[PDB]
């Protein structure tokens, strides 16, 4: 339920996904990240829990070329680096 402020590179990704706010909950941040991956079709077409984020700004933040939605720790580690707790 805590409010967070994304750092600029993360906020840019959320903005592409349609976010107009500057303060979010963690769940809302995760929501817009999924929206971004979906709109850009970064998920693997055959095994859709795999996300291929290499060569995309999201991969620069996550620091991995791909991840599994079922092994979300790279996402959470990125959030710790990119969220200011308010």
């Amino acid at each position: 339920g805590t409010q967070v402020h994304p750092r600029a590179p993360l906020l840019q990704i959320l903005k592409v996904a349609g976010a107009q706010e500057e303060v979010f909950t963690v769940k809302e941040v995760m929501h817009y990240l999924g929206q971004y991956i979906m709109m850009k079709q970064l998920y693997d077409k055959q095994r859709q829990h795999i996300v291929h984020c290499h060569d995309d700004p999201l991969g620069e933040l996550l620091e991995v070329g791909s991840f599994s939605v079922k092994n979300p720790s790279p996402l959470y580690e990125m959030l710790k680096r990119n969220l200011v707790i308010l």
Partner: peptide, 14 residues
């Protein structure tokens, strides 16, 4: 499942 379904499962956990 679809990506939307997998992400919704993850989202619920946050």
């Amino acid at each position: 499942l679809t990506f939307x379904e997998y992400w919704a499962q993850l989202l619920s956990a946050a």
